Amino acid sequence: EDTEADVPVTYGEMVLNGANLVTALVMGKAVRSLDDVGRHLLEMQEEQL
Amino acid sequence: EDTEADVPVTYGEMVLNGANLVTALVMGKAVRSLDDVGRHLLEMQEEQL
Amino acid sequence: RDPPGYRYAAAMVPTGSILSTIEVASHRRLFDFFARVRSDENSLY
Numbered sequence: 092e093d094t095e096a097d098v099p100v101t102y103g104e105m106v107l108n109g110a111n112l113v114t115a116l117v118m119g120k121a122v123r124s125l126d127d128v129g130r131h132l133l134e135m136q137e138e139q140l
Numbered sequence: 141e142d143t144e145a146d147v148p149v150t151y152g153e154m155v156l157n158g159a160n161l162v163t164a165l166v167m168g169k170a171v172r173s174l175d176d177v178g179r180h181l182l183e184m185q186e187e188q189l
Numbered sequence: 190r191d192p193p194g195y196r197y198a199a200a201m202v203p204t205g206s207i208l209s210t211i212e213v214a215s216h217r218r219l220f221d222f223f224a225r226v227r228s229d230e231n232s233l234y
Contacts, residue, residue, distance in 0.1 A: 110159060110178060112181075113174070113177070113178040113181050114163055114167055116181060117171055117174070117177060117178075117181070118163055118167045118169050118171070119169070120167045120168075120169075122166055122167070122199060123204065124204075125162070125166070127202065128162070128166060128198075128199055128202045129159065129162040129166070131202045132161075132162055132165060132166070132198060132201070132202070135201070135202075165198040166196060166198045166199050168196075
């Protein structure tokens, strides 16, 4: 049904830059994106469901 | 020597509100003052002894 | 065995949805920490 396909180019990248680093050293663990999970555990604590 | 001292009045505090709180919920460990250690693990890391 | 239970605070904010739905317990051995709950449970909190 078709010949030429469209394909994404780049890989993804997970770097520890930011507060997610400190926990790797100090806390001894890491979370994939903690710059978000860390965020939405604040707003959720306020707004709604 | 003397009958009247000079005494502090208020106690201290340690509260989890902050970036410390996330790690208490997600990572599961809470350092006393993280927002400082977390800082000083950057400037130290990028400069000197 | 070291099967640490998953982290509910993180899973409260998922990265992406699953798609297919199946009885999961049918095949367990793919997983490590596996838990069933009836409608609610005390340890979740």
